[PDB]
Design an enzyme around this catalytic site. Structure first.
Site, PDB file in Angstrom:
ATOM      1  CE  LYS A 164      -0.642  -1.122   4.835  1.00 41.62           C
ATOM      2  NZ  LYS A 164       0.035  -2.436   4.684  1.00 41.62           N
ATOM      3  CD  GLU A 190       3.222   3.265   7.928  1.00 40.77           C
ATOM      4  OE1 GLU A 190       4.244   2.990   7.265  1.00 40.77           O
ATOM      5  OE2 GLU A 190       2.417   2.399   8.328  1.00 40.77           O
ATOM      6  NE  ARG A 191       8.597   0.143   7.765  1.00 40.99           N
ATOM      7  CZ  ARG A 191       7.398  -0.239   7.347  1.00 40.99           C
ATOM      8  NH1 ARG A 191       6.587   0.595   6.719  1.00 40.99           N
ATOM      9  NH2 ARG A 191       7.005  -1.491   7.563  1.00 40.99           N
TER      10      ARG A 191
HETATM   11  N1  LIG Z   1       3.923  -2.913  -7.061  1.00 36.58           N
HETATM   12  C1  LIG Z   1       5.098  -3.337  -6.585  1.00 36.58           C
HETATM   13  N2  LIG Z   1       6.125  -3.491  -7.451  1.00 36.58           N
HETATM   14  C2  LIG Z   1       7.301  -3.915  -6.982  1.00 36.58           C
HETATM   15  N3  LIG Z   1       7.640  -4.227  -5.730  1.00 36.58           N
HETATM   16  C3  LIG Z   1       6.607  -4.066  -4.897  1.00 36.58           C
HETATM   17  C4  LIG Z   1       5.333  -3.636  -5.230  1.00 36.58           C
HETATM   18  N4  LIG Z   1       4.521  -3.591  -4.107  1.00 36.58           N
HETATM   19  C5  LIG Z   1       5.310  -3.986  -3.138  1.00 36.58           C
HETATM   20  N5  LIG Z   1       6.584  -4.290  -3.543  1.00 36.58           N
HETATM   21  C6  LIG Z   1       7.685  -4.752  -2.706  1.00 36.58           C
HETATM   22  O1  LIG Z   1       7.154  -5.171  -1.461  1.00 36.58           O
HETATM   23  C7  LIG Z   1       7.500  -4.223  -0.427  1.00 36.58           C
HETATM   24  C8  LIG Z   1       6.276  -3.909   0.396  1.00 36.58           C
HETATM   25  O2  LIG Z   1       6.539  -2.725   1.176  1.00 36.58           O
HETATM   26  P1  LIG Z   1       5.448  -1.599   1.350  1.00 36.58           P
HETATM   27  O3  LIG Z   1       5.957  -0.490   2.183  1.00 36.58           O
HETATM   28  O4  LIG Z   1       4.952  -1.191  -0.033  1.00 36.58           O
HETATM   29  O5  LIG Z   1       4.258  -2.363   2.066  1.00 36.58           O
HETATM   30  P2  LIG Z   1       2.968  -1.968   2.910  1.00 36.58           P
HETATM   31  O6  LIG Z   1       1.751  -2.631   2.406  1.00 36.58           O
HETATM   32  O7  LIG Z   1       2.917  -0.445   2.967  1.00 36.58           O
HETATM   33  O8  LIG Z   1       3.366  -2.473   4.360  1.00 36.58           O
HETATM   34  P3  LIG Z   1       3.479  -1.924   5.853  1.00 36.58           P
HETATM   35  O9  LIG Z   1       2.202  -2.137   6.591  1.00 36.58           O
HETATM   36  O10 LIG Z   1       4.666  -2.679   6.449  1.00 36.58           O
HETATM   37  O11 LIG Z   1       3.855  -0.448   5.692  1.00 36.58           O
HETATM   38  C9  LIG Z   1       8.113  -3.027  -1.150  1.00 36.58           C
HETATM   39  O12 LIG Z   1       9.102  -2.395  -0.345  1.00 36.58           O
HETATM   40  C10 LIG Z   1       8.721  -3.671  -2.396  1.00 36.58           C
HETATM   41  O13 LIG Z   1       9.992  -4.248  -2.127  1.00 36.58           O
HETATM   42 MG   LIG Z   2       3.093   1.236   4.749  1.00 33.14          MG
END
Ligand SMILES: Nc1ncnc2c1ncn2[C@@H]1O[C@H](COP(=O)(O)OP(=O)(O)OP(=O)(O)O)[C@@H](O)[C@H]1O
Ligand SMILES: [Mg+2]
Ligand SMILES: Nc1ncnc2c1ncn2[C@@H]1O[C@H](COP(=O)(O)OP(=O)(O)OP(=O)(O)O)[C@@H](O)[C@H]1O
Ligand SMILES: [Mg+2]
Lengths: 471, 478
Positions: A164, A190-191
């Site tokens: 996301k 968040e981070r």
């Molecule tokens: N569309 C995409 N294309 C390429 N790599 C992706 C994609 N979506 C996710 N990733 C990979 O997976 C990881 C997921 O991290 P991300 O920060 O996007 O997740 P999140 O859903 O926000 O999780 P969180 O709750 O930990 O913040 C990314 O850092 C990347 O390495």
């Molecule tokens: Mg996130």
């Protein structure tokens, strides 16, 4: 005199006793400024927000920072007003904390600048706007199955590490760089690394010139994590009302607000509810969500990322926030594991702009047919597993053959994903997505291999990828 | 006298309640009559709640509690290097006292948005399955998650050992481990020479819950000194899950209401406060960095559990080690589908970034296609991909215990794998191929390795192909 005394300190909750007849109102801001009288003390500079009236001239408050070093008996100052944050043109290009104090080292905000209270009632029924227009994003799945609504509320649901944040970054890159209005980003729980990276990327791209950024991260106490979103919303509300400008509002994680509320609820004397959440989960969420709306004098389109704890979509926090959104996209760890990013669930994702009179019959029929084929392929899994592929009828074999290619074609390569993989990325128009999916449904591309459809842009790139593979 | 002196009212299960202490501040250290130290958490109207940091058997009602005037602190310094200490900094290895002359607070704010810098320095762990598709950079935080007996401790110890020829301090924190296991880990570190720059903090399973809850903060506070002096630090937390269990124990002993899985509401805050403090500082702050490698143990490989999801939501990526792959010979057991590095690309040298960019997605697709292929037939291109690439990648990512492989050799081996040079050899021959290729490189191609070492880029356009062909000409197949 409006002088208080600290009675109890219980983590992030402090009890203050005032003189009789001069209790501060609820949501007022209290300040503690104490200088170490000797070597056995430390200096304190802390702000508190009034939460409850306990009787006996006592008030229970929530701290906006760490309470270490507090001694019961300290002096408390009542400011007589809720937390006020600087507002106006001065906030553009700046980074603020929960209290509205800049943290970008660019200088202090002048003391005479106009400030607005954080807490305010929601807009009334008669002031709302109602008109659906498609906000093109350049993402195949979003543009095909769950189109985003301009001026509406968009939510992204997903578990830990599903994508996301990357989707938020891609949407910012695609939309905010040419919006022409005002952009506001609110980072809630968040981070700090992600916040710093986003700030530097915006400075490099030049978008920061018209963007106001407010940051309260996971290292901050629950009070700050609850009030940072309200500060950002206070800025966005002014930009909507007093100038009538289109506003982009990004909230990094709105779940942390309710999480901090649940964390602080137990120390306020409330009985637990549901799986451990506060009894006021629905009302507190509604009071915040209902302020994020488009009105007759200004339109605010907001994109919110919503965290799903333990990948359970039936959790009360994800469950109650569904009714507050116009378009939703649901991410799945199963799709993430398969490597088909952005891993948007094609069935659970819904939008109110997907109607024949809004997107056209040509688009609507293709979307419905894709959904039907994917549903049939999902249903066929058990019979395939327990009977074998060769036991399916020629209709079901064709259904599987088309559905695998459709599912692979739903994947896309993002511009912000170039740091993860060497592929540059692409932007696909809605017409191109619809035409490509119609051609796939018509059976034109049945002879190409399955993996040629993964992580490409337009339908042509599938053809060139197949030719490169040697068809 | 109730200003700096108190009297105990209740004692039990490692927590105490004391009368008096009028001028005590929240988070202050307090000392009992026995010399056992305590922490003040709740400053109620009439009494103070104290958490006992040690053996509570010798504490009885009526004992005197007196202030210390200092917020919870641990001793830090250069003299702590090479020693084994408890969370309070007391020496445990028995080699005498510790001559530290400085202290740092346990609870310290994390660096802000403007105090950080983007991660750009690779941290070579010496393992192909990490350095190729789950890169780790300096200042990043990357957890290792998997079932019991899967090699997480082995990975951590190998990562620590690989840093011998670099100027970086290593901290190993053992939470809930067996004392014998910690002793053996220390013995291996001593044998391999890592004790010259390693600090070990231990809190065994027999210790009370407060010490288990406090140990990781002591370790990170120890690392903060070197990070803010301008040096690089690597910190390993051995069971954040056991830390969470100890914190749940303490919370339910304090009668706080339980949430999901009986964990307290602030269980996420507990881990986020600790893990958020590791960062890569900017030039204005001195350029220091702190790298964290937290550990989480799952049950039957369930990654959807509350604690695993909470810890994943904080860090910058996860390395998932699978028991089903640990058995049946795939000893590294890296699960490419569930693993990810969020600082990928920037945390690799230019050559490795150029070569191994798409490996994780390629193996994810290969695993999916292998799962699907059990049902029916395959196209020509599917048969080419699934076997000529996935099966060989799985085999070449395998690695033996305590066998560091230089990145200049890793870039060679993944380049040969990716360019299709391994397609004509059987799957079972790839490990011998890799060994003979390393020998042939050391014997004849030292100039390619030197060019990669000096420029961090690929050596040549066609000379690399020529060298690979020359090696394949003398390699005996099957
Ligand atoms: N569309 C995409 N294309 C390429 N790599 C992706 C994609 N979506 C996710 N990733 C990979 O997976 C990881 C997921 O991290 P991300 O920060 O996007 O997740 P999140 O859903 O926000 O999780 P969180 O709750 O930990 O913040 C990314 O850092 C990347 O390495
Ligand atoms: Mg996130
Ligand atoms: N690469 C490897 N090659 C061979 N053996 C290995 C490798 N990695 C780990 N092992 C072996 O696997 C076993 C378990 O490893 P390790 O103790 O590191 O796992 P763990 O997950 O930390 O275990 P525990 O839960 O018991 O602490 C040990 O016998 C170790 O020698
Ligand atoms: Mg272990």
């Amino acid at each position: 005199m409006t002088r208080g005394r600290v009675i109890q300190v219980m983590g992030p909750v402090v009890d203050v006793k005032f003189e009789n007849g001069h209790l501060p109102a609820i949501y007022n801001a209290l300040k503690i400024q104490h200088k170490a009288r000797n070597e056995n003390e430390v200096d304190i500079d802390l702000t508190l927000e009034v939460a409850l009236h306990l009787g006996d001239d006592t008030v229970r408050t929530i701290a906006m920072a760490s309470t270490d070093g507090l001694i019961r008996g300290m002096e408390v100052i009542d400011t007589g007003a809720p937390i006020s944050v600087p507002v106006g043109e001065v906030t553009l290009g700046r980074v603020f904390n929960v209290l509205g104090e800049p943290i970008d080292l660019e200088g202090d905000i002048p003391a005479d600048a106009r400030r607005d209270p954080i807490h305010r009632p929601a807009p009334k029924f008669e002031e709302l706007a109602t008109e659906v227009e498609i906000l093109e994003t350049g993402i195949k799945v979003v543009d095909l199955l769950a189109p985003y609504i301009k001026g509406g509320k968009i939510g992204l649901f997903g578990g830990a590490g599903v994508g996301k944040t990357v989707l938020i970054q891609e949407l910012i890159h695609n939309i905010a760089q040419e919006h022409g209005g005002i952009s506001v980003f609110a980072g809630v729980g968040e981070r700090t690394r992600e916040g710093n990276d986003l700030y530097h990327e915006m400075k490099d791209s030049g978008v920061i010139s018209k963007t106001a950024m407010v940051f309260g991260q996971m290292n901050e106490p629950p009070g700050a994590r609850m009030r940072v979103a309200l500060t950002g919303l206070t800025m966005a509300e002014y930009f909507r009302d007093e100038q009538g400008q289109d506003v982009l509002l990004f909230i990094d994680n709105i779940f942390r607000f309710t999480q901090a509320g649940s964390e602080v609820s137990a120390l306020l004397g409330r009985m637990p509810s549901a799986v451990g959440y506060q009894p006021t989960l629905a009302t507190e969420m509604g009071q915040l969500q209902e302020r994020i709306t488009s009105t007759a004098k200004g339109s605010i389109t907001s994109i919110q990322a919503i965290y799903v704890p333990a990948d359970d979509y039936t959790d009360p926090a994800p469950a109650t926030t569904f009714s507050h959104l116009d378009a939703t996209t649901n991410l799945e760890r199963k799709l993430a594991e398969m490597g088909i990013y952005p891993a948007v669930d094609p069935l659970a994702s819904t939008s109110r702009a997907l109607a024949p009179e809004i997107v056209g019959e040509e688009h609507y029929q293709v979307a419905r047919k894709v959904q039907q084929t994917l549903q049939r392929y999902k249903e066929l899994q058990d019979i395939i597993a327990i009977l074998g592929m060769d036991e399916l009828s020629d209709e079901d074999k064709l259904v599987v053959h088309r559905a695998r290619r459709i599912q692979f074609f739903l994947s896309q390569n993002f511009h912000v994903a170039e740091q993860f993989t060497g592929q540059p990325g692409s932007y696909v128009p809605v017409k191109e997505t619809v035409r490509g999916f119609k051609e796939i449904l018509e059976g034109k591309y049945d002879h190409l291999p399955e993996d040629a459809f993964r992580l490409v842009g337009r339908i042509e790139e599938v053809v060139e990828k197949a030719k490169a593979m040697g068809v | 006298q109730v200003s700096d002196v108190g009297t105990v009212i209740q004692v039990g299960d490692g927590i105490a309640r004391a009368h008096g202490l009028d001028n005590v501040m929240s988070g202050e250290l307090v000392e009992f009559a026995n010399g056992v130290m305590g922490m003040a958490l709740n400053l109620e109207e009439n009494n103070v709640g104290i958490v006992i940091l040690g053996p509570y058997t010798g504490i009885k009602e009526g004992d005197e509690v007196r202030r210390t005037g200092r917020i919870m602190e641990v001793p830090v310094g250069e003299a702590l290097i090479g020693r084994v200490v408890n969370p309070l900094g007391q020496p445990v290895d028995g080699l005498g006292p510790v001559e530290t002359t400085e202290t740092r607070p346990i609870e310290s704010p994390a660096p802000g948005v403007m105090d950080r810098r983007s991660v750009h320095e690779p941290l070579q762990t010496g393992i192909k399955a990490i350095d190729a598709l789950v890169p780790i950079g300096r200042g990043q935080r990357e957890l290792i998650i998997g079932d019991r007996q899967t090699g997480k401790t082995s990975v951590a110890i190998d990562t620590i050992i690989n840093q011998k020829d670099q100027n970086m301090i290593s901290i190993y924190v053992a939470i809930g481990q067996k004392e014998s296991t910690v002793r053996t880990v220390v013995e291996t570190l001593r044998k391999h020479g890592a004790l010259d720059y390693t600090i070990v903090v231990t809190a065994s399973a027999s210790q009370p819950a407060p010490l288990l809850f406090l140990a990781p903060y002591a370790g990170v506070a120890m690392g903060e000194y070197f990070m803010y002096k301008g040096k690089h630090v690597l910190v390993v937390y051995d069971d954040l899950s056991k830390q969470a269990a100890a914190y749940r124990e303490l919370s339910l002993l304090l009668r706080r209401p339980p949430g999901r899985e009986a964990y307290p509401g602030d269980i996420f805050y507990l881990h986020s406060r600790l893990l958020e403090r590791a960062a890569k500082l900017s030039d204005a702050k001195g350029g220091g960095s702190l790298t964290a490698l937290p550990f989480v143990e799952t049950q039957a490989g369930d990654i959807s559990a509350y604690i695993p999801t909470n810890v994943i939501s904080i860090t910058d990526g996860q390395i998932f080690l699978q028991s089903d792959l640990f058995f049946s010979g795939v000893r590294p057991a890296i699960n490419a589908g569930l693993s990810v590095s969020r600082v990928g690309g920037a945390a690799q040298i230019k050559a490795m970034k150029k070569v191994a960019g798409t490996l994780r997605l390629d193996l994810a697709a290969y695993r999916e296609l292998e799962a699907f292929a059990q049902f029916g037939s395959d196209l020509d291109k599917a048969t080419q991909a699934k076997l000529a690439r996935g099966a060989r990648t799985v085999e070449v990512l395998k690695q033996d215990l305590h066998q560091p492989i230089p990145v200049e050799k890793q870039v060679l081996i993944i380049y040969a794998l990716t360019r299709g040079f391994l397609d004509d050899i059987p799957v079972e021959d790839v490990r011998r191929f890799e060994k003979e290729f390393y020998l042939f490189l050391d014997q004849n191609g030292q100039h390619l390795l030197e060019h990669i070492r000096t420029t961090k880029d690929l050596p040549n356009e066609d000379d690399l192909n020529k060298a690979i062909e020359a090696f394949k000409k003398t390699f005996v197949v099957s």
